Amino acid sequence: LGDFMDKRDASIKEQLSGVKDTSSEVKQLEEQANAVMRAARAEISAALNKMKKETQ
């Protein structure tokens, strides 16, 4: 019965570390989406500015 006390509790606790891990991964997805969209934006900004000045 001791294992059953642990099993229900560890499983309940495990879901807790899993839902926390999933929330940390969605925060890292938001930060990578931030970096990839500003990556494309700053790519275009720098490329057009430099190529503009050079061919001017």
């Binding site: 229900r8 499983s11 309940i12 879901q15 807790l16 899993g18 839902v19 999933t22 929330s23 991964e25 969605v26 997805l29 938001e30 990578q32 989406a33 990839v36 969209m37 990556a39 494309a40 934006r41 790519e43 275009i44 490329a47 057009l48 190529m51 503009k52 061919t55 001017q56």
Partner: protein
């Protein structure tokens, strides 16, 4: 406590599904926008050279 734990697993897993869908769709915006802005500034390049060539022919006129 069982209800809290498995509801949190389901709602966090659909939160990560919507977050990864937003990653793919904002990367779709990012590379579509990359192609668009890149070709847009090459036609604005050709606009700049057209303007200067036209004012040169105005000069010789």
């Amino acid at each position: 406590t069982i209800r809290n734990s498995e509801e949190l697993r389901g709602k966090a897993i659909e939160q990560l599904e919507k977050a990864r869908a937003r990653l793919k769709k904002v990367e779709m915006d990012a590379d579509q926008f990359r192609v668009n802005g890149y070709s847009e500034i090459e036609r604005e390049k050709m606009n700049l050279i057209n303007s200067t060539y036209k004012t040169l022919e105005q000069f010789e006129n």
